[PDB]
């Protein structure tokens, strides 16, 4: 009967030591700096693979209706007419809804004359949904650069740090893309 009492005392002192170790690691966790970012004061750097808005050009277009069949919902419409003076068709209007858009960038890939483009815009907040049918002259505007804005602070993500950084907040050097670009390898080696 006494062995159960000694086992209970051993479990109690082990639980007290576990509580003390939890207090020790909690006091250890107060030493490190916070690793969060501020908005809209410290905006993240968009990578070359991160997609966004779809930009449309009205000059390098032939109205061939190829990317409409690639889209599962067929959101870009082609308002093409037939002209009797020429032998081809011309585009009149170009509209696309963005509230039902998946943003997967599949119509941009199947394009030989690169008529669609990827634009680094994600800040889209509107009080009404009826204005989402964007016009071609509205999609032909200049994107907002995060570098040229003097009020924001540029900070890269985890995979854009030189030689391996676990925090990625100070960045005292100007190096990026840890590795080597494939241009100096042909010069030296």
């Amino acid at each position: 009967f006494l062995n159960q009492i000694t086992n209970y005392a051993k479990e109690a002192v082990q639980s007290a030591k576990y509580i003390g170790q939890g207090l020790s690691v909690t006091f250890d966790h107060m030493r490190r700096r916070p690793i969060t970012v501020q908005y809209p004061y410290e905006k993240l750097i968009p990578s070359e693979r991160f997609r966004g808005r779809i930009h449309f050009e009205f000059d390098k277009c032939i109205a061939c209706e190829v990317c409409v069949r690639v889209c599962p919902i067929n959101l870009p419409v082609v308002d093409w007419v037939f002209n009797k003076e020429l032998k081809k068709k011309e585009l009149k209007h170009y509209s696309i809804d963005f509230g039902v858009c998946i943003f997967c960038a599949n119509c941009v890939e199947y394009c030989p004359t690169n008529c669609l483009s990827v634009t680094e815009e994600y800040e889209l907040a509107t009080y009404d949904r009826h204005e989402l049918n964007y016009d071609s002259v509205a999609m032909g505007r200049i994107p907002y650069k995060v570098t040229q804005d003097p009020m924001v602070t540029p900070i890269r993500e985890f995979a854009y740090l030189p030689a391996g950084v676990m925090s990625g907040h100070d960045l005292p050097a100007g190096a990026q893309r840890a590795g080597e670009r494939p241009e100096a390898i042909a010069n030296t080696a």
């Binding site: 070359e48 483009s117 994107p143 650069k145 670009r181």
Partner: protein, 55 residues
Amino acid sequence: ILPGMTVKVTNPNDTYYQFQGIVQRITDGKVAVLFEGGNWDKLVTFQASELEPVV
């Protein structure tokens, strides 16, 4: 510069270092640069003093 020529970005502060692009249009002293990486065509704008012409 003219729209339709190949330029190169040479800014050591930005992530895109020595990337060949295609100029789309010019307005307000800003140049739209179309990059060709992989199977997706991205368009990142820059300034007029950031790029250098490469034949």
